[PDB]
Design a protein around this ligand. Structure first.
Ligand SMILES: O[C@@H](c1ccncc1)c1ccc(OCCN2CCCC2)cc1
Ligand SMILES: [Yb+3]
Ligand SMILES: [Zn+2]
Length: 605
């Protein structure tokens, strides 16, 4: 694992973590002990190395004594390696507990600390983590590689008026014996997980039950809205369980974060984190819930061995997500979404450039920060491979037979693309002549669009294309012919696909865009997906009225899918360039650390 400085799994394995920590909002630090139960995989083992990043190590204790350790030079985004000298050589399979006293930095890339004013309630601060891909090392010392899976337990001391939650089953709460102004919250995760799945939130959280195994959590002011938006959650889990086999994690809770959470969702086990930008009022963005739910099998049970194999997580998850959505809403909607994602894949390839290395399915992340490499490619190129294979190998019933057999086979494991491919050939041994027609080298290792486009039903897409082609080919004397009734029979999804289609040909003339606002009033739409693509189209077609609206969206929430391109677009428009740069600088300190970093790079600031 070229993203990790720890001793590899072939040397030693973390089996368990017991975390005892206290969250200090005054110093913005988390402080305490990580006791790692580590098993040797080698004879005569006398040292091992752990990932850290911006941690302050106080001491390391094994068998009740302090032992020697050293921190190496920082290696950029990877952090500094921590070599621990064991007091007695270990034989193969011997296990020991190593206790590390540490403290985090305020600038931990895994954490965002928010003041009272950056929250809903305006009285309490809030903390949330995000470990994927390699940020767990910025919280505690660990072997920070998805190739190692451990169970864990934790005890978290917090201001007594706040709530701690983790990616684990809640195991109780009591006053802190060391400090009566504090509560300790307790947690257990009995299913082995890669460390990137470790998660913590502390804040003034409330919950409402929305299904037999699902509570939503958020601040008070978001709970009622959230409960309604995600009400299809149980029914999606049932479908996910029919497709993937038993849900093994006990609880499936949802946390809805403050608006700076950088992602649509993060499949932390027992507690999926989501963006508030999902709250569209009508459940239209629930594909993201189905995506997070699918990860309970693809990602969380079968895990990528290293980040070069991320597509394994994402493509199988999009593949299952799209199935859940097609069960709920029909096979033509499955194809509709499948086809739009091919649209998103053309976008990403066009941006990076068709020969760019980040456009490969399997990437080499050796000296690359995974946060810089992250995009739609592993999701959409991964999904396009599986949809192609589905159509090659006999259809969805046949291919879902394989996905379920693949999950069973590799549950509680971390695997490579070769692992996936050997199993695909084993499973379809009677269809190997067909599998040998796939150009594996191109599909897996080459840049750009896949060598083959799957067959997609167009039924629901057609109206979207038709309307978009009318706008694009319209001349000034055609603009009168447009009318609100054009949108009459389009769902929010089709309206969003109309804008995505139109956006692919942007800029349009400014008079067209103005007319579009005149007849359709897209400014009134608060659906974050739609509003996003509409502001993009407006800025790219050089409408100045749209600058304040685009600046406002870019900074009122922080989902990088929306914030990054809105800032990029505003920077590339000469009228808003200076203001874009200025607005970033003014917001930078209060932004998510990873978000700040990428937007900063994006703007060349
Ligand atoms: O493995 C990297 C990659 C591989 C292949 N192509 C591109 C990138 C990668 C980069 C960033 C990640 O960060 C994860 C942040 N997320 C949390 C929820 C959604 C994504 C996770 C993985
Ligand atoms: Yb004309
Ligand atoms: Zn995902």
């Amino acid at each position: 694992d070229t993203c990790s400085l720890a001793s590899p799994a072939s040397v030693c394995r973390t089996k368990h973590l017991h975390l005892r920590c206290s969250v200090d909002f005054t110093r913005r630090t988390l402080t305490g002990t990580a006791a790692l139960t580590v098993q040797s995989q080698e004879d005569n083992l006398r040292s091992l190395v752990l990932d850290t990043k911006d941690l302050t190590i106080e001491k390391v204790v094994i068998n009740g004594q302090e032992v020697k350790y050293a921190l190496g030079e920082r290696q950029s985004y990877k952090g500094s390696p921590m070599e621990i000298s064991l007091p007695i050589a270990l034989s193969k399979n011997q296990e020991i507990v190593i206790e590390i006293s540490f403290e985090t930095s305020p600038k931990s890339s895994a954490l965002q600390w928010l003041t009272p004013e950056q929250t809903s309630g305006k009285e309490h601060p809030y903390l949330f983590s995000q470990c994927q891909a390699i940020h767990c090392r910025a919280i505690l010392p660990c072997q920070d590689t998805p190739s190692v899976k451990l169970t864990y337990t934790a005890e978290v001391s917090v201001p007594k008026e706040l709530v701690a939650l983790m990616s684990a089953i809640r195991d109780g709460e009591t006053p802190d014996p060391e400090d009566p102004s504090r509560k300790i919250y307790k947690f257990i995760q009995k299913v082995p997980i890669p460390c990137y799945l470790i998660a913590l939130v502390v804040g003034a959280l409330e919950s409402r039950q929305i299904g037999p195994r699902t509570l939503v959590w958020s601040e008070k002011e978001q709970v009622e809205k959230s409960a309604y938006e995600f009400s299809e959650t149980e029914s999606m889990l049932k479908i996910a369980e029919d497709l993937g086999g038993p849900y093994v994690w006990g609880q499936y809770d949802l946390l809805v974060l403050p608006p700076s959470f950088p992602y649509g969702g993060m499949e932390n086990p027992c507690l999926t984190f989501v963006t508030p930008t999902l709250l569209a009022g009508d459940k239209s963005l629930s594909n993201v819930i189905a995506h997070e739910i699918s990860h309970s099998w693809t990602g969380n049970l079968v895990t990528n061995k290293t980040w070069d194999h991320f597509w394994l997580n994402e493509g199988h998850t999009v593949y299952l997500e799209r199935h859940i959505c097609g069960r709920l809403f029909g096979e033509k909607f499955r194809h509709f979404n499948a086809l739009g994602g091919w649209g998103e894949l053309q976008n990403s390839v066009k941006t990076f450039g068709e020969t760019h290395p980040f456009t490969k399915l399997v990437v080499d992340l050796t000296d690359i920060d995974p946060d810089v490499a992250y995009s739609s490619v592993p999701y959409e190129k991964g999904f396009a491979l599986l949809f192609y294979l589905e159509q090659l190998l006999g259809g969805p019933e046949i291919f879902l037979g394989f996905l379920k057999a693949y999950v069973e086979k590799f549950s509680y494991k971390s695997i490579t693309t070769d692992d996936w491919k050997d199993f695909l050939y084993s499973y379809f041994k009677d269809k190997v002549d067909v599998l040998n027609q796939v150009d594996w080298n191109a599909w897996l290792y080459s840049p750009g669009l896949p060598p083959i486009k799957p067959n997609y039903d167009m039924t629901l897409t057609n109206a979207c294309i038709a309307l978009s082609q009318r706008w694009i080919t319209a001349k000034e004397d055609d603009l009168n012919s447009f009318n609100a009734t054009d949108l009459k029979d389009l769902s929010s999804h089709q309206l969003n696909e109309f804008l995505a289609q139109t956006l692919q040909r942007a800029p349009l003339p400014l008079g067209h865009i103005k007319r579009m606002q005149e007849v359709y009033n897209f400014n009134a739409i608060n659906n974050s997906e739609i509003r996003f693509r509409w502001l993009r189209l407006c800025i790219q077609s050089k409408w100045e009225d749209a600058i304040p609206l685009a600046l406002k969206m870019a900074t009122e929430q922080g989902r990088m899918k929306f914030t990054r391109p809105l800032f990029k677009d505003l920077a590339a428009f000469d009228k808003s360039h200076d203001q874009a740069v200025r607005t970033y600088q003014e917001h930078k300190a209060s932004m998510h650390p990873v978000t700040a970093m990428l937007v900063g790079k994006d703007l060349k600031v």
